[PDB]
Amino acid sequence: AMMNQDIEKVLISEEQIQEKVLELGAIIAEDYKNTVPLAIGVLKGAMPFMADLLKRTDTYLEMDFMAVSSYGHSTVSTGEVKILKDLDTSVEGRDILIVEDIIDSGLTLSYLVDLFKYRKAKSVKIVTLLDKPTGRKVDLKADYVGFTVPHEFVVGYGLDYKEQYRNLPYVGVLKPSVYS
Amino acid sequence: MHHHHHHSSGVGTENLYFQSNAMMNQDIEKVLISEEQIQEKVLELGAIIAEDYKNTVPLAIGVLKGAMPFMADLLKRTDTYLEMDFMAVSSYGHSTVSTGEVKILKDLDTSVEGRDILIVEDIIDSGLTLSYLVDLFKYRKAKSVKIVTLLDKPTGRKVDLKADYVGFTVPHEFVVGYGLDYKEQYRNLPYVGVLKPSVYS
Amino acid sequence: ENLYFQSNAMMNQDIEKVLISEEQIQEKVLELGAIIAEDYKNTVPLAIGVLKGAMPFMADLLKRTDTYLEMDFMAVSSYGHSTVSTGEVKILKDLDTSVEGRDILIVEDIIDSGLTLSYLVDLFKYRKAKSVKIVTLLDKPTGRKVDLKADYVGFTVPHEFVVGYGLDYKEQYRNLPYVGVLKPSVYSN
Amino acid sequence: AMMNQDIEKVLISEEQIQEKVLELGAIIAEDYKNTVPLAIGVLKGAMPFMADLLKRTDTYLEMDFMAVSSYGHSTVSTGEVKILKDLDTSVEGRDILIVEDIIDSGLTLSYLVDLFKYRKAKSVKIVTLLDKPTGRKVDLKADYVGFTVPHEFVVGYGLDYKEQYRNLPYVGVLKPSVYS
Ligand SMILES: Nc1nc2c(ncn2[C@@H]2O[C@H](COP(=O)(O)O)[C@@H](O)[C@H]2O)c(=O)[nH]1
Ligand SMILES: Nc1nc2c(ncn2[C@@H]2O[C@H](COP(=O)(O)O)[C@@H](O)[C@H]2O)c(=O)[nH]1
Ligand SMILES: OC[C@H]1O[C@@](CO)(O[C@H]2O[C@H](CO)[C@@H](O)[C@H](O)[C@H]2O)[C@@H](O)[C@@H]1O
Ligand SMILES: OC[C@H]1O[C@@](CO)(O[C@H]2O[C@H](CO)[C@@H](O)[C@H](O)[C@H]2O)[C@@H](O)[C@@H]1O
Ligand SMILES: OC[C@H]1O[C@@](CO)(O[C@H]2O[C@H](CO)[C@@H](O)[C@H](O)[C@H]2O)[C@@H](O)[C@@H]1O
Ligand SMILES: [Mg+2]
Ligand SMILES: [Mg+2]
């Protein structure tokens, strides 16, 4: 059994992903040409996009990562999450760029954004591969967006179903029998 | 003789060499706060805190490693329903020294939102790091954040931070014992002592 | 959203009986501290407590151990299948120094199945500890799922659920200065 | 004022890397066709290679990451490191595939490999982008290797100099003036 056999439809092809990442990287490269920002990804979903985005971003930058976990309901309410791994370097006075795979409710990411401002970040911006604005549970707008999607039930290029499918080179929708 | 090495985040290794009959007490010039004084103080503070937190189940949090002995003795003299949690942090270097911002190595196991937080500490001096943690808990929407410290050096402050409860105000002496260390040793003393100058240079 | 009612409720009202009183605990902690101090005369051990329950006992025991030593702490969490059957746990907070060449003394609240503790002991051996020993306040050896004998033990207890002195029931009671048994009416799961 | 200006010479081009990654991905997809392994990346340097390698690995897999920090001398002489972020799932009985940017001394990686075997891993294999066997301080052989290199003084594609240059899409050598 092969993975493509579980995909009902490719919603965004690899070619489309590659073209958009080239575009976003040039845009971000120009916006931060002056000062080296701290590019941060939240594990695990953001990893593939961050890697390709940053490699298409011709400007000095530092990479870092955080890992967090849910606290149950305060996470599904305020976005507060337990920090499992904090950044390797200080946030104060740095220009932060959060690299995300998808923004739906926006809760956890909003929490992290305002955490970085509490930590006195010079600025905080977000670049997300996919955005789902109809999902918002807080007011949070991404500064850079690859693709605006109608729903979050997709897999690939970082997105998983039961921890699998993150490795697909495109973004697709699963066949119903896979999850039901 | 005996020796070992440990990690030190301001070097990053220290090698420690001990003589077979060296004893902690001989390194102490004088006892500053005896165990008996400490027992009496935690008894008094615990009854006070038990009264102040009578209507709520607070989350008492200790900042590892130094707060552990005081937190254990204080909480067992605090006769009220409460939960315990712990945090571990790491310095970012010159930037922690000047802002208080630290790396979270171990975050709380439960959420801060809507909780009455009681932070238990061993000593407050510059107050930078503790202040960072207090306002972190407020950013996390705690209902209230209070601090109880065994020792306070309030004129050493680099930020405004008044502890809600303090065991003893300490003057001009470098102390160890009851959680406080010198190169990771002495934390296990049951009293607070003044370390002989020859030990630290 | 959350409302709390304690009224003038006190924890003692929830305790059917005090199993090990504060006085009993302090006398045994003092004896243990003296034995450990003697056993560890010739070395500076790394005493490690496993959060959260071991803390009250660790504080009192080390205060009664008159010998040079370093303290450290670890935090761990379950994986759910391999933990239940092999003791493997996720490390949430590792030690702040290396284990290589150290004499490790693991301070514990109670040992029941001993699966996680066994995992940690052998982890420390893999990390090249010079020695690994265990001191536990309580021991429930009838409950074992692996062969693991503590090197130092305070009290052997039956296979019954207890609280106090670090031990909790739904995150409460850790602050009691004794080990007690809850009234049946108290535990609604 | 651009990163390329700090690069004395491209050792391994983006094109050479993309071609090698395609070849490794196919080999790995084939070797692990029967069971979904746990693909683990050690932050931070392994991230770009891991993302592009797995993307070219057409088989079911789960991704995970670890974060580690030095303890000082013990790290330097035994590879023992402080775990800052452990795996999100258990190792017992899983086939582990560690993805690395470079293996030089091999000390820490050997430590993590034998840690996974202590954790009862069904098997542990390593895929590295770069290999420098002349630099070994323990006998550790990668199962899969992108390129063998004489020395480790290189940047790009995850490899850094003072936390910068990780985002270059190729592997290069810095000009002397960059590190004085
Ligand atoms: N051991 C010891 N530490 C001190 C003393 N005075 C200040 N400190 C250090 O100051 C640290 C926290 O103080 P702050 O970050 O508020 O300045 C403590 O960890 C403590 O080690 C002292 O007299 N003895
Ligand atoms: N509160 C409480 N916890 C217990 C009791 N017995 C076992 N435990 C829990 O189980 C752990 C030891 O279980 P083991 O891993 O040895 O099977 C203890 O650290 C504690 O968390 C008990 O009687 N009371
Ligand atoms: O399934 C893709 C679907 O999305 C659309 C409409 O939302 O494209 C949207 O997102 C693009 C990404 O920026 C925009 O360029 C476009 O303007 C916007 O409509 C459709 O193209 C398509 O049906
Ligand atoms: O309320 C008593 C309580 O206050 C503390 C500070 O938290 O000490 C203050 O009050 C004492 C007398 O009431 C003074 O002697 C002391 O100098 C002052 O700081 C605690 O130590 C005490 O438990
Ligand atoms: O920069 C390439 C460099 O590597 C060498 C040896 O250092 O050859 C390596 O690369 C080959 C191409 O993948 C490998 O097949 C081979 O195993 C490895 O030795 C040199 O030829 C070259 O200068
Ligand atoms: Mg400070
Ligand atoms: Mg167990």
Q: Residue A26: exposed, middle, or buried by beta-carbon count in 10 A (0-12, 13-18, 19+)?
A: middle
Q: How far is the C-alpha of C12 from the C-alpha of C155, rounded, in Å?
A: 22
C88 lines ligand 2 (CB under 6 A): no
Catalytic residue among C39, C72, C112, C151: C112
**Nearest by CB to C98, which of B7, B23, B73?**
B7
User: Which positions in chain C touch D114 (Cβ < 8 Å)?
Assistant: 126
Q: CA triplet A33, A34, A39: central angle to 5 degrees? A: 65
- Which tokens in the block code for residue D132? 């420098």
Q: How far is the C-alpha of B153 from the C-alpha of B159, rounded, in Å?
A: 13
Nearest to C138, CA basis, from C59, C53, C11, C44: C53
Q: Which of B68, B70, B123, B166 to mutate to test the pocket of ligand 1 (most atoms within 8 A of CB)?
A: B123
Q: Which CATH class is domain B1-201?
A: alpha beta
In what order do the strands lie in the sheet containing A144-148?
Answer: A81-85, A62-70, A38-42, A95-103, A123-131, A144-148
Q: How far is the C-alpha of B172 from the C-alpha of B125, rounded, in Å?
A: 12
Q: What is the DSSP letter of B196?
A: P
Rg of chain B on CA atoms, in Å: 18
C128 in Cβ contact with C101 (< 8 Å)? yes
Q: Which chains touch A (3 or more CB pairs under 8 A)?
A: B, D
Fold of C1-189: Rossmann fold (3.40.50)
**Which are the contacts of B81, defined by CB distance < 8 A and separation ≥ 6?**
B57, C6, C9, C11, C172
Q: How far is the C-alpha of B59 from the C-alpha of B39, rounded, in Å?
A: 23
* Cis status, amide bond into A44, omega within 30 of 0: yes
Neighbouring-strand partners of residue A11 = none
Q: How far is the C-alpha of D99 from the C-alpha of D61, rounded, in Å?
A: 13
> Looking at chain B, which residue has its C-alpha nearest residue A82?
B107
User: Which positions in chain D touch A47 (Cβ < 8 Å)?
Assistant: 41, 47, 50-51, 63, 65
B124 in Cβ contact with B65 (< 8 Å)? no
DSSP chain D: --GGGGEEEEEE-HHHHHHHHHHHHHHHHHHTSSS--EEEEETTTTHHHHHHHHHT--S--EEEEEEEEE-SHHHHHH--EEEEE--SS--TTPEEEEEEEEESS-HHHHHHHHHHHHTT-SEEEEEEEEE-GGG-SS----SEEEEE-S----BBTTB-BTTBSTT-SSEEEE-GGGG-
Q: What resolution in Å is listed for this PDB structure?
A: 2.1
C168 in Cβ contact with C162 (< 8 Å)? no
> Looking at chain D, which residue has its C-alpha nearest residue A34?
D1
**Chain D within 8 Å of A83 (Cβ-Cβ)?**
no
How long, in residues, is chain A?
A: 180
SS3 labels along D79-113: CCEEEEECCCCCCCCCEEEEEEEEECCCHHHHHHH
Coil vs helix vs strand at B112:
coil
| Residue extents of the structural domains in chain C | 1-189
**CATH code 3.40.50.2020 for A1-180:** yes
C181 in Cβ contact with C165 (< 8 Å)? no
A105 CA from centroid of ligand 7 (Å): 37
Residue from B3, B13, B103 to probe the interface with D (highest D Cβ count within 10 Å): B13
Q: What is the DSSP letter of A74?
A: G
Coil vs helix vs strand at C69:
coil
Q: Which residue's alpha carbon is nearest to atom 13 within ligand 4?
A: B44
Q: Which residue's alpha carbon is nearest to atom 13 within ligand 3?
A: A147
DSSP C1-68: ------TT--GGGGEEEEEE-HHHHHHHHHHHHHHHHHHTTTS--EEEEETTTTHHHHHHHHHT--S-
CA dihedral A45, A48, A51, A55 (to 10 degrees): -140
Q: CA triplet A32, D43, A103: central angle to 5 degrees? A: 55
What H or E segment, with its residue span, contains residue A11? strand A7-12
**Chain B within 8 Å of C118 (Cβ-Cβ)?**
no
**Which are the contacts of C92, defined by CB distance < 8 A and separation ≥ 6?**
A84, B106, C75, C76, C77, D86
Nearest to C104, CA basis, from C83, C73, C130: C130
D109 in Cβ contact with D137 (< 8 Å)? no
How long, in residues, is chain D?
A: 180
B141 in Cβ contact with B115 (< 8 Å)? no
CB contact under 8 A, A52 and D51: yes
A92 in Cβ contact with A119 (< 8 Å)? yes
Question: Residue C144 CA: which ligand is closest?
Answer: 2
What H or E segment, with its residue span, contains residue C119? helix C115-126
Q: Is the dihedral of CA C162, C166, C171, C176 positive or negative?
A: positive
Q: How far is the CA of C158 from the CAs of C16, C138, C149, C161, C162, in angstroms?
A: 16, 10, 16, 9, 10
> Looking at chain A, which residue has its C-alpha nearest residue B96?
A90
Method for structure elucidation: X-ray
Active-site amino acid positions of D = 104
User: Which ligand 1 atom lies nearest to the CA of residue B127?
Assistant: 16
Rounded to a whole number of angstroms, the distance from the CA of C135 to the nearest CA of chain B is 16
CB contact under 8 A, D3 and A48: no
Neighbouring-strand partners of residue C70 = C46
Q: Which residue's alpha carbon is nearest to atom 7 within ligand 3?
A: A148
Q: Which chains touch B (3 or more CB pairs under 8 A)?
A: A, C, D
Question: Residue D130 CA: which ligand is closest?
Answer: 5
Neighbouring-strand partners of residue C181 = C17
Q: How far is the C-alpha of B160 from the C-alpha of C125, rounded, in Å?
A: 46
C53 lines ligand 2 (CB under 6 A): yes
Cβ atoms within 10 A of the Cβ of D179, count?
Answer: 10
Cβ atoms within 10 A of the Cβ of A101, count?
Answer: 24
What H or E segment, with its residue span, contains residue A22? helix A14-31
**Chain A within 8 Å of B198 (Cβ-Cβ)?**
no
Cβ atoms within 10 A of the Cβ of D138, count?
Answer: 14
